[PDB]
Design a protein around this ligand. Sequence first.
Ligand SMILES: *[C@@H]1O[C@H](CO)[C@@H](O)[C@H](O)[C@H]1NC(C)=O
Ligand SMILES: *[C@@H]1O[C@H](CO)[C@@H](O)[C@H](O)[C@H]1NC(C)=O
Ligand SMILES: *[C@@H]1O[C@H](CO)[C@@H](O)[C@H](O)[C@H]1NC(C)=O
Ligand SMILES: *[C@@H]1O[C@H](CO)[C@@H](O)[C@H](O)[C@H]1NC(C)=O
Ligand SMILES: *[C@@H]1O[C@H](CO)[C@@H](O)[C@H](O)[C@H]1NC(C)=O
Ligand SMILES: *[C@@H]1O[C@H](CO)[C@@H](O)[C@H](O)[C@H]1NC(C)=O
Ligand SMILES: *[C@@H]1O[C@H](CO)[C@@H](O)[C@H](O)[C@H]1NC(C)=O
Ligand SMILES: *[C@@H]1O[C@H](CO)[C@@H](O)[C@H](O)[C@H]1NC(C)=O
Ligand SMILES: *[C@@H]1O[C@H](CO)[C@@H](O)[C@H](O)[C@H]1NC(C)=O
Ligand SMILES: *[C@@H]1O[C@H](CO)[C@@H](O)[C@H](O)[C@H]1NC(C)=O
Ligand SMILES: *[C@@H]1O[C@H](CO)[C@@H](O)[C@H](O)[C@H]1NC(C)=O
Ligand SMILES: *[C@@H]1O[C@H](CO)[C@@H](O)[C@H](O)[C@H]1NC(C)=O
Ligand SMILES: *[C@@H]1O[C@H](CO)[C@@H](O)[C@H](O)[C@H]1NC(C)=O
Ligand SMILES: *[C@@H]1O[C@H](CO)[C@@H](O)[C@H](O)[C@H]1NC(C)=O
Ligand SMILES: *[C@@H]1O[C@H](CO)[C@@H](O)[C@H](O)[C@H]1NC(C)=O
Ligand SMILES: *[C@@H]1O[C@H](CO)[C@@H](O)[C@H](O)[C@H]1NC(C)=O
Ligand SMILES: *[C@@H]1O[C@H](CO)[C@@H](O)[C@H](O)[C@H]1NC(C)=O
Ligand SMILES: *[C@@H]1O[C@H](CO)[C@@H](O)[C@H](O)[C@H]1NC(C)=O
Lengths: 621, 338, 177, 48
Amino acid sequence: VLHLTQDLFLPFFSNVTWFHAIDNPVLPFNDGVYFASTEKSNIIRGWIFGTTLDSKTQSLLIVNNATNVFIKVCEFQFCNDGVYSSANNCTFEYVSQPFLMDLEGKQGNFKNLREFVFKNIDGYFKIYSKHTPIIGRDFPQGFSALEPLVDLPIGINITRFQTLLALNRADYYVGYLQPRTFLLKYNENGTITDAVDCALDPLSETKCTLKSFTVEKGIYQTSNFRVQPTESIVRFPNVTNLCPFHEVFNATRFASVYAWNRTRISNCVADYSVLYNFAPFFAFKCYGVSPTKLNDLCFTNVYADSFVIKGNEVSQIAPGQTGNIADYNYKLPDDFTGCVIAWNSNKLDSKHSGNYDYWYRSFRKSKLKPFERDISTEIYQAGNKPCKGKGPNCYFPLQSYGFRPTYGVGHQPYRVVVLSFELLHAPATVCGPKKSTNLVKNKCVNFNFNGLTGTGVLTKSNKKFLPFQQFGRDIVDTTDAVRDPQTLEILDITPCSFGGVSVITPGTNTSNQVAVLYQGVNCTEVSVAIHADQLTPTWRVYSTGSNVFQTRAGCLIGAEYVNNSYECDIPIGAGICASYQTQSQSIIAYTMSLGAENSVAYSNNSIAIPTNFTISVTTEI
Amino acid sequence: LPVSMTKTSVDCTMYICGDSTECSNLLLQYGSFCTQLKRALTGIAVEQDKNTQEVFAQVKQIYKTPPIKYFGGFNFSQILPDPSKPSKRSPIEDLLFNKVTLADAGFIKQYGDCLGDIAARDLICAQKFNGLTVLPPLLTDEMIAQYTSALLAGTITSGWTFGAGPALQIPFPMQMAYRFNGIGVTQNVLYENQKLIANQFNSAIGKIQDSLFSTPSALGKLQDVVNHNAQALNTLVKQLSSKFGAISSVLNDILSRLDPPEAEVQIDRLITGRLQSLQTYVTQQLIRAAEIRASANLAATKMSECVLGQSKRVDFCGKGYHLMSFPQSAPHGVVFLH
Amino acid sequence: SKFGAISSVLNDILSRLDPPEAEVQIDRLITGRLQSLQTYVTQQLIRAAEIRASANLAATKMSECVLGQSKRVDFCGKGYHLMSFPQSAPHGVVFLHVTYVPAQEKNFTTAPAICHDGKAHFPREGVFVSNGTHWFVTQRNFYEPQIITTDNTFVSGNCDVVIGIVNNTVYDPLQLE
Amino acid sequence: LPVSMTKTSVDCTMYICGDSTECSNLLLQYGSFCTQLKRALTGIAVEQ
Ligand SMILES: *[C@@H]1O[C@H](CO)[C@@H](O)[C@H](O)[C@H]1NC(C)=O
Ligand SMILES: *[C@@H]1O[C@H](CO)[C@@H](O)[C@H](O)[C@H]1NC(C)=O
Ligand SMILES: *[C@@H]1O[C@H](CO)[C@@H](O)[C@H](O)[C@H]1NC(C)=O
Ligand SMILES: *[C@@H]1O[C@H](CO)[C@@H](O)[C@H](O)[C@H]1NC(C)=O
Ligand SMILES: *[C@@H]1O[C@H](CO)[C@@H](O)[C@H](O)[C@H]1NC(C)=O
Ligand SMILES: *[C@@H]1O[C@H](CO)[C@@H](O)[C@H](O)[C@H]1NC(C)=O
Ligand SMILES: *[C@@H]1O[C@H](CO)[C@@H](O)[C@H](O)[C@H]1NC(C)=O
Ligand SMILES: *[C@@H]1O[C@H](CO)[C@@H](O)[C@H](O)[C@H]1NC(C)=O
Ligand SMILES: *[C@@H]1O[C@H](CO)[C@@H](O)[C@H](O)[C@H]1NC(C)=O
Ligand SMILES: *[C@@H]1O[C@H](CO)[C@@H](O)[C@H](O)[C@H]1NC(C)=O
Ligand SMILES: *[C@@H]1O[C@H](CO)[C@@H](O)[C@H](O)[C@H]1NC(C)=O
Ligand SMILES: *[C@@H]1O[C@H](CO)[C@@H](O)[C@H](O)[C@H]1NC(C)=O
Ligand SMILES: *[C@@H]1O[C@H](CO)[C@@H](O)[C@H](O)[C@H]1NC(C)=O
Ligand SMILES: *[C@@H]1O[C@H](CO)[C@@H](O)[C@H](O)[C@H]1NC(C)=O
Ligand SMILES: *[C@@H]1O[C@H](CO)[C@@H](O)[C@H](O)[C@H]1NC(C)=O
Ligand SMILES: *[C@@H]1O[C@H](CO)[C@@H](O)[C@H](O)[C@H]1NC(C)=O
Ligand SMILES: *[C@@H]1O[C@H](CO)[C@@H](O)[C@H](O)[C@H]1NC(C)=O
Ligand SMILES: *[C@@H]1O[C@H](CO)[C@@H](O)[C@H](O)[C@H]1NC(C)=O
């Protein structure tokens, strides 16, 4: 089976800092580390993980001995050389069989290599190892699987990494693994014979895309290429004046719910940290934009509705929800898109001997339409009496919201206010902070123009936008031109750099040399992008100046152009084909020859007649 | 007869999710749903290429007309390539190219001028903005004219022999006599009225050019195929402005407005809508490609019979007793002169 | 494929969640799997239509090339068709088209007609050809020159309108006897 | 030999929603999904 996996795997042909010994530098730990060592008998005992390696954060000791092991999770300080200096509040004392198996055939030349891999995904510390006798030398290059030994869930940050040594009276091979996709060849007995890193060479990505160690001669579309952005211009309008949320919150007379006071917030800059520090929040259930991205969004108009209520009514008021406060006092639209705010206020809506100032409606002739006020004093009708007054079956619509300093939490005076964002696209006014960076008219950039996020390029545009046209668009609904909010100049937005990468390869058995064809994109664009190292493809096809052919189906890289002509071998497109031809061998691209150039000797009395014949047996499938 | 359609390589991931990591992650939860789509579109492209090959590359060797052009009085200058024209085509070939307008040439590498578009970017620039590109056909419109000219020179200088084996030269009046003998009339009558038949042939060839010139659309089938493909692509791109019953229709502002574990529902709604629309497009393209494959196989059989020989089957190679057929290349198709 | 659900196995999904909460996950699986199955069935329909077209082509090819000689050029393989021997193949058929293909040929001076005595002579079948001195009639696809007799030719003309008239002597078997 | 089939002109809007304004409004949220269906059925009729 050719199972494909995505995990933390040491990249093929990476960089390993080979060390020596004769002081024990601390090495960074990130996404796990690959450890390997070859030794005579023993010079290394264990390893130290954690952070700051002191008596402040819990750390890990994996010291072995010839008898068992001593994995533990304790807050030791430093031995500076005892090893369990000030063990301290300890945890997870583990003892098991030794990791270090050493065998000799009555001679010391069997310098067995021990490859160890440690990683700390979601706690659950995993350790892998494998012992293989030497055949020649260091970091031999033959394949070798790694089996797990112990999987103990430590569940602690590990970021530094260190090792122990030995004493009494050529190793330290360390590599750092990366999140990569691998294709692994399994053998009949359940064992890993060969593996290939898909994110390595064009051939590697091709074989991986079809999950087969043998790629037959042909061209195979494997992936796509896009230029990742370098930098990012975020520019907003040219305002700075702070919004009055301070009033909306440093008021006292917040409206009763029967008449919810509604302010409008516009032409200002919203930084909701003031809203945060003006209230020991009790419920911040946003129904529009997340508070995290609240300062990253722009609003055409913002409506702040202030109305004090109680814990039950705080939950009661919500996009199109039931409840007399919601159905007869203040109603939120079913599609409400705004943040609601609720903080406890027992200091402004309470006093000794009580306070019954506030009001709320329980008796209405019908339901409350969203964002519609119903301030009125009309006695509810009961039965069929046109009665106008208080008492039996003639009930006042609105009853007191009486507040005292001593109720239960559900009966406490919760101060509720709400910011009903519009998030339409009309010229914006309340934009959050974000800081305006400058322009970059010709380089692909991630933009956040007035809440509108996206990626592309910006160039000068004569688009005669009439002085009211803003967001702008194209034929099929894709923002094409945004007038710079500050310079009013008009900016077209162009796609980043997309086409498609297809790998042209001969039979892996015939050869491994590969040729890459970026689809429908000029080599110049690819070159300035390859040179700037902003191309998403991590496989860097070799360029020698002689391997660049701007064709009509994009650009071909890794195959030279021979101004001769042959029968097509591998169809590329637009009349060019690539093939494996001798020089001593390489990949050449050529214009396909439609056949042998033949001329007929037609003339007014010349005829050709076969004086002989042949018989042929073709086949049709 | 249509021979091919525009080859498309829509990228599902790009179409359903725009450079959005969470959207791509949630698309991965749909399994190898759309690798099928990429495979099907690749198969369609390869099938179109094979259709063009079957229709046109029917010769074993490249053939060329004699430097002099005197075919017994028959005037053919309207169908053999014109040396003066840079494209090396015929008046009929150009009329055909001038009466068919392609929405997306594909071999333009239009990247770089969407930014210099100044005015609203064209359909193409917009399709590029949402991952729907057009691959160009393997055979260009220039060497396809070379294949057509090779077929033409094979018929007028070697009769139908070159369609079987080696091209044997034979005088054109003699080939006329033999085709006449093929429909039950002696060769003597042709030799007797060779002048009259030559004049009639010249008149008919001349009047077909005016028939194609003055007609609004006699190329209705090819333009219909091109319009169908362009309209399918436009309907594909237009679904990206459809909310599909969610808060908004843009991935970028949806992610920038809702936190991950509530925007998940909306993003899944978009994924379900867009994948369903893409499946609609791919299935319709498969059906139309099967139709075009049938039409192109009919065209290849028609070429192999009417062009490389005389066909006895009545009303197959045009109305009336068939004599010859001169092929002409057309945008995404072939046109016969029976 | 999880299809956006808690897990991808019905057995552990039912064994982990109670019915009226596992309903949503099971419906998500149903929607995913039915859509994938519809994809498969539609693709199989399309491929089966393609195979039906190919098999109808094969049946016509059998009925023509096998059960007879087909005059349609380049249909039963390249060259002048003679026979075709079918052979069974796994999920298909393979034909063995026996074809007649010409060979070595030479330029021959040819004339549309021969004008013996004021009258044009056209070959009953074949081409008039010239070895360089004596004129000869022969077939279409094999050089078998024969003496130009009144049997080989039919006479109809006036030797003034038949373009390519080429004076020469025809023979008759009567004046000798 | 069959020559034609019965020509159908199924109305997606009517089929999915019966004279229901809210249902038609929520169907409009699916975009030009089914204008494709009407176009395909018209093409089938013309082809027959
Ligand atoms: C890391 O390895 C790669 C591949 O062999 C090599 O190109 C690169 O120069 C190496 N880097 C260092 C610092 O050795
Ligand atoms: C080796 O380690 C094991 C486990 O910690 C311990 O039981 C044993 O006593 C140790 N041996 C020596 C010599 O310290
Ligand atoms: C454990 O934590 C307590 C409380 O912070 C601290 O006083 C003590 O020194 C720590 N270590 C031990 C050995 O108890
Ligand atoms: C580990 O420590 C780093 C700071 O050094 C911190 O950013 C990170 O979140 C920590 N991880 C955990 C799991 O605490
Ligand atoms: C250290 O020396 C002692 C005394 O000879 C010996 O028993 C022991 O095995 C030595 N340890 C190592 C690791 O060589
Ligand atoms: C699988 O294991 C058996 C038993 O050791 C061995 O005989 C066989 O050769 C192995 N197969 C392979 C392919 O290595
Ligand atoms: C409003 O803010 C000012 C300044 O921080 C403070 O003095 C005042 O008490 C606040 N008012 C309320 C009601 O929070
Ligand atoms: C509503 O708020 C505005 C702005 O603070 C204020 O001027 C107005 O008096 C308020 N109305 C009520 C009913 O409190
Ligand atoms: C704000 O923008 C307008 C329009 O570009 C400009 O006239 C004005 O001077 C700007 N104000 C500042 C202080 O930048
Ligand atoms: C290709 O395959 C043949 C047969 O197994 C083998 O002899 C040859 O070495 C292979 N070539 C390469 C470069 O793998
Ligand atoms: C791509 O490079 C070719 C090289 O000849 C050049 O002619 C062409 O204009 C370039 N295309 C673009 C879009 O830059
Ligand atoms: C093709 O290559 C030959 C050999 O180098 C060269 O002389 C010739 O000029 C080249 N073709 C063209 C059109 O430049
Ligand atoms: C063939 O015909 C042309 C046109 O009449 C004439 O110029 C030429 O001489 C003729 N050649 C022969 C060999 O008769
Ligand atoms: C015809 O070809 C055959 C087979 O090559 C050969 O044996 C024979 O001599 C040839 N005959 C003539 C007349 O050329
Ligand atoms: C065909 O007619 C055109 C237009 O009169 C003339 O230019 C050309 O020489 C003619 N060609 C032949 C082969 O007679
Ligand atoms: C006829 O003569 C021409 C010119 O020499 C030559 O190219 C051609 O091959 C000859 N044809 C035959 C069949 O002999
Ligand atoms: C053609 O064949 C005849 C047969 O009688 C012979 O007499 C004549 O010389 C030949 N002409 C040539 C070889 O040019
Ligand atoms: C054939 O002979 C007759 C009689 O002399 C003559 O009038 C005629 O022109 C000759 N034809 C040719 C083509 O030489």
